[PDB]
Amino acid sequence: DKATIPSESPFAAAEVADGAIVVDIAKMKYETPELHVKVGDTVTWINREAMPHNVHFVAGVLGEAALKGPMMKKEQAYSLTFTEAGTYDYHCTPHPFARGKVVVE
Numbered sequence: 259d260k261a262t263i264p265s266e267s268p269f270a271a272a273e274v275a276d277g278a279i280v281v282d283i284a285k286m287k288y289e290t291p292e293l294h295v296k297v298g299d300t301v302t303w304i305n306r307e308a309m310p311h312n313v314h315f316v317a318g319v320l321g322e323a324a325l326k327g328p329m330m331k332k333e334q335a336y337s338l339t340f341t342e343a344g345t346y347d348y349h350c351t352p353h354p355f356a357r358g359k360v361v362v363e
């Protein structure tokens with residue numbers, strides 16, 4: 259694939275390491291809708307709100323299958339490690355007007 263998944267299910271925001279590359283989900287949006295990272299970097303999304311949110315990459319983007327991330331509860335996190343350069347668009351499954359991309363260089 260173009261990314262590996264450190265944790266298949268969400269984990270506590272408070273457990274996210276200092277230094278992590280974090281995208282906040284707040285105000286019903288990805289607060290960094292265009293993020294540029296380097297190959298090998300891990301991106302961590304953190305849901306700051308009460309409604310559950312995820313990240314969802316359609317098939318062919320991160321790999322053959324869609325990556326429909328797990329629903330993060332408030333103050334939960336979810337990470338992806340990008341292993342190949344590319345431009346990877348995603349959206350929130352419950353709230354698909356919220357869209358983002360990770361550009362991996």
Ligand SMILES: [Cu+]
Nearest residue numbers: 311312350353
């Ligand atoms: Cu969402």
